[PDB]
Design a protein around this ligand. Structure first.
Ligand SMILES: *C(=O)[C@@H]([C@@H]1NC(C(=O)O)=C(SC2CN(C3=NCCS3)C2)[C@@H]1C)[C@@H](C)O
Length: 265
């Protein structure tokens, strides 16, 4: 039984686990704690990029954004190198998704604009996709630090799966913008030990991870079977029992994904 397997992993990693996979033609939805709130952490960056793509002409990607030393306030493997020269909107989207660059996300939020430094417009974007659950309240690095239980900066496995489904498989974006988002997630560098680790090599996986305090570890993916059948997989976790400095455990997500892959085969 799937629920028993998920509960077992929770005991193994002293963690809370959330899983959602939307129903398809012939598969029932897979759900474990799927409507419980979990922190977005960096997973919001996938719909953030979609919002920015949607909001602008495609050549907005070529606009150069400048920024300063006091803009580097979180893990930013890419942006840390380019405060001098700036970064284009395209480069920022690339960094935000593929390297989970936090400064890039802050700059993209600022680009989207409006109250809360873009957090309000980001949330508005999700509402336009029918997501009445998720909310973004802060930018990097605060958004990763809300106490366990707090609703600030949270989504649910169910909500984020439905959003991602519209983004990648559905019609939320035009084909050219949709391809841009998909390619970046396809070329993600941060996800090898998560959902990717649970699916066989002949399955295609694109994804965006999230990591944070209180042992938070998330992964949202779209996967394709060797015959081109797509599934959306959202896995989220925290380890509140360990407190603020609790280590995230990627293995938990790899194991969860392995269980899901067994069903989807
Ligand atoms: C978002 O959750 C934070 C950001 N997100 C990100 C992640 O894992 O998703 C980490 S960066 C990172 C460095 N890294 C591994 N190095 C070898 C392969 S992957 C993942 C970080 C916490 C936030 C800063 O935006």
């Amino acid at each position: 039984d799937l629920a028993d397997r998920f509960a077992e992993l929770e005991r193994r990693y002293d963690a809370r686990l959330g899983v959602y996979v939307p129903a398809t033609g012939t598969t029932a939805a897979i759900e474990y704690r799927a409507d419980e709130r979990f922190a977005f952490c960096s997973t919001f960056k996938a719909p953030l990029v979609a919002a920015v793509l949607h909001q602008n002409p495609l050549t907005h990607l070529d606009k150069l954004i400048t920024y300063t030393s006091d803009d580097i306030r979180s893990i930013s493997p890419v942006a840390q190198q380019h405060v001098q020269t700036g970064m284009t909107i395209g480069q920022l989207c690339d960094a935000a998704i593929r390297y989970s660059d936090g400064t890039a996300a802050n700059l993209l939020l600022a680009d989207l604009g409006g109250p809360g430094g873009g957090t309000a417009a980001f949330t508005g974007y999700l509402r336009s996709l029918g997501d009445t659950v998720s909310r973004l309240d802060a930018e990097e690095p605060e958004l990763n630090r809300d106490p366990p239980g707090d609703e600030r900066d949270t989504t649910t496995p169910h909500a984020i799966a439905l959003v991602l489904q519209q983004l990648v498989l559905g019609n939320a974006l035009p084909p050219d913008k949709r391809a841009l988002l998909t390619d970046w997630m396809a070329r993600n560098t941060t996800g090898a030990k998560r959902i990717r680790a649970g699916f066989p090599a002949d399955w295609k996986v694109i994804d965006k991870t999230g990591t944070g305090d209180y042992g938070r570890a998330n992964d949202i993916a779209v996967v394709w079977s060797p015959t081109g059948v797509p599934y959306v997989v959202a896995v989220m976790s925290d380890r509140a029992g360990g407190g603020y400095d609790a280590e995230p455990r990627e293995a938990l997500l790899a194991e969860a994904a392995t269980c899901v892959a067994g069903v989807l085969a």
